[PDB]
Amino acid sequence: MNKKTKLIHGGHTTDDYTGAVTTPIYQTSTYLQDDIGDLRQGYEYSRTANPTRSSVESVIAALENGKHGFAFSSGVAAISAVVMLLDKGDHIILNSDVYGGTYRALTKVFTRFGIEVDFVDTTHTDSIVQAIRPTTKMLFIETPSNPLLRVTDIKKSAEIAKEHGLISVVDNTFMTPYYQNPLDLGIDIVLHSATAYLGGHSDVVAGLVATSDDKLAERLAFISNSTGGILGPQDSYLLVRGIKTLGLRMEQINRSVIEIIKMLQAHPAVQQVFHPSIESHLNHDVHMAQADGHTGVIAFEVKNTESAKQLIKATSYYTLAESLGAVESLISVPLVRISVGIEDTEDLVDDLKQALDTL
Amino acid sequence: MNKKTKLIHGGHTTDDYTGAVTTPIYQTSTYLQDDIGDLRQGYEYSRTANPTRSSVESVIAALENGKHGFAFSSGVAAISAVVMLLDKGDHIILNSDVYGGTYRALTKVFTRFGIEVDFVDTTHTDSIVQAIRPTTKMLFIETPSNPLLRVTDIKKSAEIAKEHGLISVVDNTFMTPYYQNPLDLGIDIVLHSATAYLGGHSDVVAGLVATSDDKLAERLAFISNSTGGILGPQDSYLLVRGIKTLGLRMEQINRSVIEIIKMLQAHPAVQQVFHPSIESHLNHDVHMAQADGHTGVIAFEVKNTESAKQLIKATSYYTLAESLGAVESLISVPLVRISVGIEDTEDLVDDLKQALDTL
Amino acid sequence: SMNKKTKLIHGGHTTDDYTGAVTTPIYQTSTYLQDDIGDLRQGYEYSRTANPTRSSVESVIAALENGKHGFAFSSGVAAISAVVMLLDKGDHIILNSDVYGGTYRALTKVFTRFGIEVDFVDTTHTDSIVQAIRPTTKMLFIETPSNPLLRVTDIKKSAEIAKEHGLISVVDNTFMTPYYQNPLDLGIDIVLHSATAYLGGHSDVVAGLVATSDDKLAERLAFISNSTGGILGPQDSYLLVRGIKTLGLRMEQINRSVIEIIKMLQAHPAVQQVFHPSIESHLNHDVHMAQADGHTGVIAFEVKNTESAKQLIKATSYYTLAESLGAVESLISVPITDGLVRISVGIEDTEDLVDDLKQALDTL
Amino acid sequence: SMNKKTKLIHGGHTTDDYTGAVTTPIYQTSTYLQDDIGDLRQGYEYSRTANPTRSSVESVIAALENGKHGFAFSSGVAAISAVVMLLDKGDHIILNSDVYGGTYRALTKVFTRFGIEVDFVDTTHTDSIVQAIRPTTKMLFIETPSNPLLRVTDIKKSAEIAKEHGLISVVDNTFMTPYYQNPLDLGIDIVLHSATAYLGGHSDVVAGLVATSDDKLAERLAFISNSTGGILGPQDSYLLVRGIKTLGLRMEQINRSVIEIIKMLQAHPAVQQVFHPSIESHLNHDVHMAQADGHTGVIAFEVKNTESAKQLIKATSYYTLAESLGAVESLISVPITDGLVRISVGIEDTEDLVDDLKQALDTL
Numbered sequence A, B: 001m002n003k004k005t006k007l008i009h010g011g012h013t014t015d016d017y018t019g020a021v022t023t024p025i026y027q028t029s030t031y032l033q034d035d036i037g038d039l040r041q042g043y044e045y046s047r048t049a050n051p052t053r054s055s056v057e058s059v060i061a062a063l064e065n066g067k068h069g070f071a072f073s074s075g076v077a078a079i080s081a082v083v084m085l086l087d088k089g090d091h092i093i094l095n096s097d098v099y100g101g102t103y104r105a106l107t108k109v110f111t112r113f114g115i116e117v118d119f120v121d122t123t124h125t126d127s128i129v130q131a132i133r134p135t136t137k138m139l140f141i142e143t144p145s146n147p148l149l150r151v152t153d154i155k156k157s158a159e160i161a162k163e164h165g166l167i168s169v170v171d172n173t174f175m176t177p178y179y180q181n182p183l184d185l186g187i188d189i190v191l192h193s194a195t196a197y198l199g200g201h202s203d204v205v206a207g208l209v210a211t212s213d214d215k216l217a218e219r220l221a222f223i224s225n226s227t228g229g230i231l232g233p234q235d236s237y238l239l240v241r242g243i244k245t246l247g248l249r250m251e252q253i254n255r256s257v258i259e260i261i262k263m264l265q266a267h268p269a270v271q272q273v274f275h276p277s278i279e280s281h282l283n284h285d286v287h288m289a290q291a292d293g294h295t296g297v298i299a300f301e302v303k304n305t306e307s308a309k310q311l312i313k314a315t316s317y318y319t320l321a322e323s324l325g326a327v328e329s330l331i332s333v334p335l336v337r338i339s340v341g342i343e344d345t346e347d348l349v350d351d352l353k354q355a356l357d358t359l
Numbered sequence C, D: 001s002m003n004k005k006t007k008l009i010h011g012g013h014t015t016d017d018y019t020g021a022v023t024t025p026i027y028q029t030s031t032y033l034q035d036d037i038g039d040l041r042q043g044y045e046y047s048r049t050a051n052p053t054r055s056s057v058e059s060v061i062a063a064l065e066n067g068k069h070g071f072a073f074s075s076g077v078a079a080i081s082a083v084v085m086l087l088d089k090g091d092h093i094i095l096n097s098d099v100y101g102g103t104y105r106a107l108t109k110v111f112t113r114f115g116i117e118v119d120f121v122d123t124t125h126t127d128s129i130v131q132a133i134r135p136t137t138k139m140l141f142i143e144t145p146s147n148p149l150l151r152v153t154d155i156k157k158s159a160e161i162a163k164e165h166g167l168i169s170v171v172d173n174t175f176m177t178p179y180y181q182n183p184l185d186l187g188i189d190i191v192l193h194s195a196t197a198y199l200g201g202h203s204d205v206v207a208g209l210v211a212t213s214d215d216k217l218a219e220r221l222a223f224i225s226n227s228t229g230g231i232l233g234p235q236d237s238y239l240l241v242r243g244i245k246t247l248g249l250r251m252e253q254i255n256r257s258v259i260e261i262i263k264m265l266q267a268h269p270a271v272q273q274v275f276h277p278s279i280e281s282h283l284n285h286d287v288h289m290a291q292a293d294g295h296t297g298v299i300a301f302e303v304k305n306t307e308s309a310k311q312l313i314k315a316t317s318y319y320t321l322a323e324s325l326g327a328v329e330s331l332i333s334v335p336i337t338d339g340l341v342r343i344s345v346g347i348e349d350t351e352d353l354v355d356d357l358k359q360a361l362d363t364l
C-alpha cells in the first residue's frame, strides 16, 4: 500500500458486525459477559480497552510501521506515560529546545519523583554520548523542534541509544507519520501530539504512542490502565476521521511552505527564517535523509516586538492562536511562528507579504 | 437551593452568548485572540481550559460545596494527579480495602517514584494516628469501600489529618455528592470516579476533583495542565447531562437497596450481607452521622464459587459487567457484588430472589 | 412481565450484541459493506433506510407504547408530516380545535396544497367528531391533553369512532408520554411524540417518534420515511435512548411537584383560572383519569393581564423563560389570551418550585 | 477575493465569536433563554427554527455556491422534498429522465398525491425541455451529471428556459460539488446537494443542503423547513462543516485518479463503454467543460454481463461494495443494465486504485 492508500485502509476502521465503513463511536463504559470472564470480543471495561480507541491505536501503529498503538487524552499525557517507564534515580536526555510543556512536566513534576533530567544540544550527536550517565535510561528527541526547527539525527541517536542501552523516544508531532517514521530508523518509541496534524481540524486534544517492542508496549498498556490518561471514544473517532485526509493536507501545506519561505527570505523586514528546507539550515541534509517532506511550522524574525504585533493585525487569513497543524493557518509569537494551513497558496503568500509590507 | 434544585441549576450549565439552556460542546482545540494575550472569554488552549470542561468542573465544585473543580479523563487519572501533589520520599496512608486500581497505581507506579505507601485498617481511627511517619504527607480514604463497604470516620480522619499536617483526600464515588460531602467535614480534597454514579448511564469514563483550598487547586491545575489527563468536551457534556438526574436516580436506587437487603438477610442461601445500612455493620452509626443516604453497591456471600456462577445465569435483569452506579443493575464476583440500578424495585427483588432459590 | 421502570431500562434493544456494550454504539456512518452483492451482514445497507443507533430508539418507543414498529424522525413536526403523508389528494383529516401551533401551521399552510382538507373540531365532545366526518374523511388526529389549555379528549371513544367510520386514528402523546398514557392499547392506530419534550427530557434533542402495531401502516410509514428522508441522526438517536432511561423517575418527580404547584395556584388571589387535567372541575377530568394513570407537567393559568404576566416571569428564579417543555429545568412562557401563562414543571425540588412561583405571583 | 481553497476554510462563519474558538461549537440544545419576553440574546429561540451549529453549515454552503441563504436538512431527500413543497396542487415539475432513484420514488409515489404531476425529460437536448413545458409547469429540476450514466445537461440554457417560461430552476449539484460547478452563478434559482456524498466526504453524515440568492424563495424555504421539521442535527451539522474543510484537496485528488482510471478503462478489453463527462466522445462533453472546471469522481462502465460484474467486485481490494458515494474510501456498486458497474473514486493512491481495478478486470 502506498502512503495515500494506507491512510484510508490502514488499521481497523470499519465494523465487522454491521459492515459500517466507519468506526462506531462506542460511548460506553462496560460490556456484557456471556460467562464469568468470557469476553464476547475482548472488551470488559472502557478504560482498559474501548473499540473506538482500539481503532485509532491500530491506525497510528500502522502509519508508523509499529506493532502496538496507544491513544491518550493529550500529547502531554502520552509523554507522561512514556516518562513513567523509568524509576526513581533514572536519568533522561532531551534536546535543549524541547517544547515548553515537556520542559515543565519533566523539570517541575518528574524531578519531584527522583527522575533527573538534562537538556542537551542534540544537533551535534557528540553531545549525546558524553552526557550518558550510568543511571541514564532514556533518550527523548523532537525533530524538528519548537519553535526554531532544530534537526536532530534520528538514526545516529538510535544507534547511540542502542549501544548505551537507552529507550529511544522521538516526538514526531511536527513531521507526522506521513513524512517521518522514527521506528523505521531504529527508535524504540514514537509519540505524537495528535492535537496538531493528525486531527488536523483544531477540534481534538489527544496523544498517540506507537512501538514495535512487545515489552515497552506491555509496560505502556499497564501505565495507561494504571494512570487512566486514556482518550475518549468521541475524540478517538474524530482523530480517525481527520487522519484520513492527512496525506492530502500535508501535501497542500508543503506546497505553500515552499512559496511562503521564498517570500520570507526576500523580504527586507524579515531576518532569520528558520525551517529545515533552507539550505543554510543546520543539519539540513540530515533532515532530508530521514524525511521525505517538510513541516508546516515556520519561524522568522522581525525587527522587534512591536513589528510582530503589527504584522499579526494586518493579516487576514492567519489566525492568532496557540496550536499548530490546523486546516486554518495559525500565527503566534513564542520572533514570529506560523503554522501553514491548507488555504490557497497564493492567498497565504500574498496575505503575509502585504502584512510585512506595512512594517 | 435544596438538593434536587442544586443538581439542575448548580454551577454554570448554560450559554450566556446564545441563551442555550445546555452547555455547548466545544469540540475545539484553540481560541482566537483579539490582541496578543487578550483572551476573549479567558480561553487560549483547550488542554489548559475548555468551556465544556469548565462547566462540569463548576458543577462538581457546587455539589460538593467546594470552590474549584477539576475534570479528568478517568477516576484513576483524578487519583493520579492527587498523588502527584507529593514529592520523592513522602508517605501516604490509605485504607486497607482500597479499590484495586488505586492499589495498583500506588504500589506499582508511584512506589517507583519514591512515594512510600502503607495500607491501614482505617475503620479504627487509632490505627491512623500510629502509622503517621515524619514523612507522612497524605491521608486517602474511601468510604464505603470496595467491595465490602467498610465505613471510615471522615470527620475524625479530617481532624487527624489537620493535627498532623496531612492533605486529607476522600474517594466519594460510592456515596456521590447527593448523600455525602467530605469537604463539609473538614476534608481537603474530594474526588469521584465519574464513570459510576455521576454519569449514571454507563457511557462516560471520567474523574472529578473538588476542593475549597486555593493552594491545592493551584497545584492541581498545574498538574492537570502539565500531565494532560484532561476530560474531553463530549464526555464533559454527557457528565453534566447525567448529573442532572443524580438525585432522582439515587433515591430510586436507595428504595430498592432497602428491599433487596431485607430479601438477602432472610434467604437461606445467602450468608454475610455487607452494606452500611445493616445495624450489625461495623461503623454503621458513623456512616449515618456523615451521610443522609446509602450507596447502591451491595455485597453478599453464597456457598461457594459455583453457586455464584449459577446465581448470575439465573438472573434476568442483572447485567454481568465490571462497573457500578448504572441505570441498569450490574453483578460481578470480585462473594457476589451487585450495583443496584433504577429498575422497578419489586422486579429487582424478585429477580434476585428466584435466582437464589435455584441454589 | 416487566414493570414500567424496568421496561425503561431493558425495553427494546439498547445494547451491542457484538462487543457486549451495555449502551447502543453511535453508528456515525452512512453506508455498509456487503460481503456478497445483496448480502447484508446485519441487515444494513444505507443509514437513511436503516441505522443501528436509530433502530435502537425505534425499538424503544415501540416497546414503551406496546407497539410493533417504531420510527424516529428529525423532529416532532417531521413525525407529524410523515403521518399526514399517509393520505392522498382529496382526503380529509379531523383534528382537535386547539392543536399545537406548528401542526395547525403545517396542515393549513402546507398540506392544504397536498389536496388534504383539514377540519378542526372540539373533540372534547365526541359528538362533534361524528358530526364532522365527511365522506372523504380518512384520518383522525387528536392531542390529549392539548396545548396550552390541556383539553382532554376521550381516546377510547375516538378510536371506536375512527374504526366505525374507517378512519386512521392518530394520537399525539407528547404531553402524557408512554409512562402514563398508551393510546395503542386503547385501539389507536398510530401514536406519535415530540421527543424534544419529555422522552429526551434534557432539552438537548429535537426529534420525533412514531409507533404502531399495524403492519400495513408501518410499511407505508417506512416507505415515506425513506422516500422523504426526515430521519433522525445517530447522535440524536443515542441521546434520545439515554434520556428515556430516566423517564419514569423524571415524570414521577414532575407529577409530585405538579400536585403542590396546582394547590398553590388555586389559592393565590392573583391567579384566576388554572388549566390541568388533574383538577376535579376540569372538563373530561374523569375521562383522563380512566385513560391515563398520571399527569403531564405542563400547567396553564391566568393572571390579571399581560403586564402581570411579564412581571411574574422576571420575578422567578428557577423558571427559564424559553420555548419547548418537558426538560429537567422548569420552563415558563406566555402563549389563548394575554394573561395566559404556561409552565413546564421540571425536576427541581418541589418546595423550591412552589415557593419560587408563589413569591413571584405575590409581587403582582 | 478569496480563492476556492481559502474559501473552504474561512467561508461563512465557522468560529465562536464568544470564546474565540476556531471551530463551530456543537449546540446540543433545544431552546434558548430570553432575557425579556421576545428579546433574543443572539437571535435563537428554538433549535428547530434556528440552531447556531446548523446556521454555521448553512452559511458555508451559501458562500461556497455564491448564494445568500443556506438551509441544512436531515438528508438529501429531505432537501428535495422541501424544494418540491414550493409548489401547489396541480403544479407541474420537469425532471431529467435519469434522475436519482430516490427522487423518482419521491416524485412518483408521494408527491403525485400532493397534486404535483411530474414529467421526466431527456434534458440533454434542451429542445425536449421546451416541448414539455405545460401551462401548469412551475419548476425545472435537473441532475448534471446524472446517476449512474452521468448525462450532462446545459445548465445555462436550462436557466434561460426556466426564466423565459417563469419556472423555478433547481439543480442537484451533488456529483459536481460547489468546488467545480456553481449553478447559482449560471442563473439557477435553487441549488441543492446530498451532503452525504462529497461535502461530508467521510461517509459518516446523512444530510441535505440547499442554497439560493432569491429572498422570496428563501423565506418560503425557511417556512417549509420549520413547518415540516426535516432539519439537520447539531452533531451532523458540525461534522458536515468539518468535512467541507478538506473538500478541495479531496476533489483534486479524486480528479487525478479519475483521469488515470478512465484511461485504464478505455484500454481494457473486458470493458466496453465508459460513461464520464471528461471523455471527449461523451454527449455534451463541451457543455460540461464550459459550465464546470472539474469532474466528479463517479464513473460508470460496462462489463460483459452480470457474472463478470460480480466476479470483478470480489477481485478488488480497495473498492468497498456498498451504497453511497463521494467518500474518502473508494466504493463500487452495480445499479441501467446488468453489466453496468458504478465506482466512486476515493482519495487512495492513484497508482493503487488503477492497479487494483486493472488486475480485477483482468480475472474476467
Ligand SMILES: Cc1ncc(COP(=O)(O)O)c(CN[C@@H](CCC(=O)O)C(=O)O)c1O
Binding pocket: A074, A075, A076, A077, A099, A101, A142, A146, A171, A173, A174, A193, A194, A195, A196, A205, A206, A207, A322, A323, A324, B045, B047, B228
Ligand atoms: C511538539 C509538541 N509536543 C507536545 C505538545 C503538547 O501536546 P498536547 O496535545 O497539546 O497536550 C505539543 C503541542 N504544543 C502546542 C500547544 C502549546 C500550548 O498550549 O502552550 C503548541 O506548541 O502550539 C507539541 O507541539
Ligand SMILES: Cc1ncc(COP(=O)(O)O)c(CN[C@@H](CCC(=O)O)C(=O)O)c1O
Binding pocket: A045, A047, A228, B074, B075, B076, B077, B099, B101, B142, B146, B171, B173, B174, B193, B194, B195, B196, B205, B206, B207, B322, B323, B324
Ligand atoms: C471507588 C473507585 N475509585 C476509583 C475507580 C476507578 O475510576 P475509573 O473511572 O474507572 O478510572 C473506581 C471504578 N472501579 C470500577 C472498575 C473496576 C475495573 O474496571 O477493574 C469498579 O469498581 O467496578 C471506583 O469504584
Ligand SMILES: Cc1ncc(COP(=O)(O)O)c(CN[C@@H](CCC(=O)O)C(=O)O)c1O
Binding pocket: C075, C076, C077, C078, C100, C102, C143, C147, C172, C174, C175, C194, C195, C196, C197, C206, C207, C208, C323, C324, C325, D046, D048, D229
Ligand atoms: C404537542 C406537540 N406536538 C408537536 C410539537 C413539535 O415537535 P418538535 O419536536 O418541537 O418539532 C410540540 C412542541 N411544541 C413546542 C415548540 C414550540 C415552538 O417551536 O415554537 C412548544 O409548544 O413549546 C408539541 O408540544
Ligand SMILES: Cc1ncc(COP(=O)(O)O)c(CN[C@@H](CCC(=O)O)C(=O)O)c1O
Binding pocket: C046, C048, C229, D075, D076, D077, D078, D100, D102, D143, D147, D172, D174, D175, D194, D195, D196, D197, D206, D207, D208, D323, D324, D325
Ligand atoms: C444525486 C443524488 N441526489 C440525492 C441523493 C440522496 O440524498 P441522501 O443524502 O442519500 O438522502 C443521492 C444519494 N444517492 C445514493 C444513495 C443510494 C440509496 O440510498 O439507495 C446513491 O445513489 O448511492 C444522490 O446521489
